[PDB]
Amino acid sequence: GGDGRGHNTGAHSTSGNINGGPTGIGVSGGCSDGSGWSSENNPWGGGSGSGIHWGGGSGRGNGGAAPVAFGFPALSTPGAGGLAVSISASELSAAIAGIIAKLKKPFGVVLSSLIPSEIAKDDPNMMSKIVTSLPADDITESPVSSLPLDKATVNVNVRVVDDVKDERQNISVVSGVPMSVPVVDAKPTERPGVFTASIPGAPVLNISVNDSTPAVQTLSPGVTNNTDKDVRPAGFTQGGNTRDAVIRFPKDSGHNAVYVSVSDVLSPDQVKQRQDEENRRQQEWDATHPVEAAERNYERARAELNQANEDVARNQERQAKAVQVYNSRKSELDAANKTLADAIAEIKQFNRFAHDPMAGGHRMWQMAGLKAQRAQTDVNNKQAAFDAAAKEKSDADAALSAAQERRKQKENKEKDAKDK
Amino acid sequence: AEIYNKDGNKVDLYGKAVGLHYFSKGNGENSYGGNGDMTYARLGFKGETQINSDLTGYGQWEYNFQGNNSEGADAQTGNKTRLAFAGLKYADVGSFDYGRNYGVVYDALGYTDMLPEFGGDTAYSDDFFVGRVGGVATYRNSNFFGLVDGLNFAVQYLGKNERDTARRSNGDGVGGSISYEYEGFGIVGAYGAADRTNLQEAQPLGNGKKAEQWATGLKYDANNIYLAANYGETRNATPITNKFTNTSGFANKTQDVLLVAQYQFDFGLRPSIAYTKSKAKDVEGIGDVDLVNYFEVGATYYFNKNMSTYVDYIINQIDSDNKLGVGSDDTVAVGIVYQF
Amino acid sequence: AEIYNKDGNKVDLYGKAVGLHYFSKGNGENSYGGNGDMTYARLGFKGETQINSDLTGYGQWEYNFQGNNSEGADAQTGNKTRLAFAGLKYADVGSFDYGRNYGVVYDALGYTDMLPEFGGDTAYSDDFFVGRVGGVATYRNSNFFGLVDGLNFAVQYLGKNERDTARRSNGDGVGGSISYEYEGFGIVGAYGAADRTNLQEAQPLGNGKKAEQWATGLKYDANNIYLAANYGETRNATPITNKFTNTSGFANKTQDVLLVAQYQFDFGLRPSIAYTKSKAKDVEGIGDVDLVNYFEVGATYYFNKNMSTYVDYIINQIDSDNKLGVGSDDTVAVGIVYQF
Amino acid sequence: AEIYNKDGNKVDLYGKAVGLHYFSKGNGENSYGGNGDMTYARLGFKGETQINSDLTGYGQWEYNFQGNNSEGADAQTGNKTRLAFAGLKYADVGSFDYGRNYGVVYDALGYTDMLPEFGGDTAYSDDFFVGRVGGVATYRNSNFFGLVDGLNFAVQYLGKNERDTARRSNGDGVGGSISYEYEGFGIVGAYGAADRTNLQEAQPLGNGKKAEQWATGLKYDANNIYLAANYGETRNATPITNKFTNTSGFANKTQDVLLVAQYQFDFGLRPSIAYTKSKAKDVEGIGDVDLVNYFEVGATYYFNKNMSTYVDYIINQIDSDNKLGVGSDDTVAVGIVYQF
């Protein structure tokens, strides 16, 4: 308010200027006596350019939603307007292609693991969800484009699903049976390349395509990236806290259809609940065959085999790490032994002056003394460390023999079992 | 004040400081204006130079710095450059300027924008023609080439601006305005039309490309009195936000009516009264609704041109059940101003 | 400088530039002040106008622009408006102002804040009453209505400010300050009390609601000499940050001691010495600790009113083992100043 | 303009406003300069004071505010302080200054940077010695203590700057420049050397520590004519960005050639032509490439000292297949200027 005061409309001007001239306004006189001050002095000026130059010249030197990689479960804190997700166009990394190809030829492979203890540190209310996205064509046998608009549930070859295993909830890629997920169209929004999918039973999933920035993988203390990508049996209750859907874009957008799963972060009570129900369902499924031994054993021996396999893998890991530790400590030793040979050559060098107290060399002699005794202590330390590493390495070498005998026994058990 | 008026060039540094506060019931979320300290200082410079007897060139710039902000990350919040332009005044044909300046439609909407603090809500900034924007080329005629006294007209072209937000973006536009002042009476009519950018269409609300505004203004100012009445209609031009949906956009149709009546006294006093109303129509999912509907009752003591104090009490008639999360609460503001 | 003095109105544009640098061992993380280039320029305007013989109105504003920043995204970092307020001075009863200004307790703390660059650390900014804050209304009496010469008092109300960070927030507050100057000697006492907002209480450190500051100052200034000693105590008012915990908050109790002794010479020279200390008590989990503990030794050559150079060496006595990650390193600063 | 010249002290407020626009094919991503409205206003203050007959002290500061930005969160984008320094001029021995100022190499590169809007592309800002930077201490001699007229030399030390970006960061540096002006003819030579910070070395592009720049300039200005030719070579000094890779760093080697020919008329006219070229060598993965290669054809009409208009058409010869995603499009700019 108050803007109207004054504020003339039409053209804008206030009053008469002091002088006429655009660039030549002063008082008077020209023809100069050179005096600098008299009535015949022209300039009538002083302190012309006492200050220094300040950058002479014009001086106009020049002129006046990071996307989450496909297949990498990440936390999205919700808003009132729903979840925020931004996909990319760049095709899914080697990792996920690998996993899904392996899996093509209920079991599954664990992408990530969840830890409420940590997830709450940043999201105390436990409102955050876990979003994951894949390019529809890698999941669906029939491209989503070439699909009736009437279909609400498209068939899928794999899905991203929450499971409860080893006392943690974890997000993982499942497959191997008839599966099928909601198909929903993506209304656009103000932002350019940004739509709103609404999956039944999830929040508003507002997506945003972005193929300008190079894709990123977000890293959150709760969500881990389980290196072990072995195929394991999957939950009977898999998905009990997951909502996924194939989302298609409008024809005049040019955006490929994308699959997205959105899983809840379970609290630890809910995780004990899921584990319990899972154990009850495993109990159920166990028998009902001809007898308990026929099937229960089938299962205990296949699980035991898969575990022995994990044991072998971790043992091999330990042995490849112990081989490097061994070689490293060995070369540290070698190095320190060359340094020792050096210092002891310098002592042979200046030995002459050992009993010559008034020579230059007889300084460098004690100095080489110091050098040698140090390098020797060093060598001793490298020897201790190398011995220790050789011990660890031998232990590992036996660990492998034992673990792979165990794998052989568990694989024979798992054969006998699978025959019965 | 004029600090340098030499060499056929004159510079008028004009700046002011305003210790301001807003009061209202509650925290102030629903208050018309807000609540708390709104102190701010503005600085600007105007300059003229008569290149020729019949041709002179002028340049004006203004910036606003807010003092209510803290010294942390929010120091720059609310700090901006309002006006920055230049131009030349020929003897009679008129004058032509370019830069960042008020839109022609603001010329019409100036009559109502006489309130001490509130007022001119419809004249949003960075909007098509109602408020001050950057990238305008304007030609103006005074007294129709000196033919008819008091009747002046202006035309304005608006270069497209592609910004991040539809609220601040625009496209190619055109507009015109005419104002006849006779014997104290004043009449004005302004019209502006432009095309909405693709980003603008992307808004959930709003439909169509031609964003159109136009307005008509009447007034009488003299004898320490000032009456004014501006009626303006627009299509797909006015911004609107929905707190319930937390979604924004533009109004398919809008009618706005503003009325002001202010008296001034010899002893530096100016009581003021203002009625206001704005109704948007054909809103997507909200039908027709009223954006603003309130009375003003306020006053201003003018100690002198350079010192003044003022108060304004806004009786917000908006209801709480309004379908756009608009603030349905009254408000008041008290301000003191120094200006050179 | 006075640029406009006409029509019973006077405008004084005051601005300066400071080429500054900070040195210290290492990168400067542990240095008291810091390290590197700290060049900055400040601009401001003061204005007065005698409305009546007994009544005059004044408005003052100041801004600080930093030159150390680059021309990229960090250009605006550290740029802010220090002071922006207005007010009126009656003949004898006193004067009343409002805006963004120093808190009454700063009046007491002015005696110690005479150092060239460092000093007045206790008078933090955006703190309740010790430093310059926004939303204060102050009334001042000079010579107790002209009754007793040299004895003047001020009172200040502080409107609540709900900001994003507890560091910059406050609540309803009140305060007062009195200063008696006699024969060169000077005495002052200031007290301020306010309520902490929920964000402040929610902070891990600090406990209680009444955020309280108060200070007492004594001095003797004459014959080119200036001695000063300010002792101030506060509750839940001083800000504190823990690098080890990377957590901030307020101090349940704090005592601060400041001592200054500066001499001036006819030949534009002014050596200075300053002692300082601040001890916080009842810290949550840290008991009692020292926030700052250092000596000053510096000097200043005054070429004239408009040109000066200066140097300051800060002997930080704080130890590295302090339980708040405080800088246990010495520091030095060298500055040159032009000012109009 | 000189606003205050009293008490042996003089203040010159200098500021201007520029209504500017850039045209080019397409949205302007690939345009040399850009496209749209580029209006901006600069404000600055210079101040001097003769402390003694043989010793005077000066301080200067400049800021640039852009008007193209909107009034939302992006208001401050492109707003910065160009120059902010101070210093003293002794009678004959010379002068010493410190602050944020042009690097010595700018002295050599000034000859080519005479264009109305474009020009001086090689003289990047916040670069080692070619452009204006903060933390420099410069000494200058005029006419070699008055021994040889027209021959003046300068030396400059550059304090290290560890910023967030390698583009804006630097380290300890030194430089010198010599300029002999005789009877209108002019010759200059400048050299600068500094060390790159870890962030700069850590950049994917660029390799080595010694960032080196140097330049040689020749000119003749008289009879309303201005000819100039500057050749400068640098190592690990020029910044470079790859749109294809969206990765930046510095250029292992760079050669830059600038040529200018401008004529001036009595009736406030000055047509201009400029050739320019810059080729980087030993680029990581791109071998040798041309960063900029264009012609200039432009003009400027000077209505008076305070008012001017100008146009510049840049014939960008860079090809689309350039291996750095550089803009291979022409461009043009049209500007109007008021300045006091």
Numbering used by the authors:
A (entry chain D): 3 to 66, 85 to 125, 132 to 446
B (entry chain A), C (entry chain B), D (entry chain C): 1 to 340
What do the paper's sentences say?
The present work focuses on the group A endonuclease (DNase) colicin, ColE9, a member of the E group of colicins (ColE2‐E9), all of which use the same import machinery but target different nucleic acids in the cytoplasm (DNA, rRNA or tRNAs). At its N‐terminus is an 83 amino acid intrinsically unstructured translocation domain (IUTD) that houses three protein‐protein interaction epitopes (Housden et al, 2010); a 16‐residue TolB‐binding epitope (TBE) associates with the periplasmic protein TolB which is flanked by two OmpF‐binding sites (OBS1 and OBS2). Escherichia coli porins OmpF and OmpC are abundant trimeric β‐barrel outer membrane proteins with narrow channels running through them that taper to an eyelet, 7–8 Å at the narrowest point. Tol‐dependent colicins assemble a translocon at the cell surface that involves its periplasmic target along with the OM receptor and translocator which together establish the import pathway of the toxin.
Single particle analysis revealed the presence of two populations of ColE9 translocon complexes, one where the translocon was intact and a second class where BtuB was absent, which we refer to as the partial translocon. The final post‐processed map of the full translocon is at an overall resolution of 4.7 Å, according to the gold‐standard FSC method, with local resolutions ranging from 4.7 to 16 Å. Although the resolution of the full translocon map did not allow for local refinement of docked structures, rigid‐body refinement were carried out to generate a molecular model. In the fully assembled translocon model, the 22‐stranded β‐barrel of BtuB sits at a 35° angle relative to the trimeric β‐barrel structure of OmpF. Unmodelled density, most likely that of a single molecule of LPS, is wedged between the two proteins which likely contributes to displacement of BtuB relative to OmpF. The cryo‐EM structure of the intact ColE9 translocon reveals that the colicin also has to overcome a 35° tilt of BtuB relative to OmpF, which it does by having an R‐domain with long enough reach. The coiled‐coil nature of the R‐domain, with BtuB at its apex, means the cytotoxic DNase domain although absent from the current structure would sit ˜60 Å above OmpF. In the full translocon, the orientation of the ColE9 T‐domain is fixed by the R‐domain’s contact with BtuB. Finally, TolB is held on the periplasmic side of OmpF through its association with the ColE9 TBE but is not well‐resolved in the full translocon model. Density for ColE9 was better resolved in the full compared to the partial translocon where only the T‐domain was resolved.
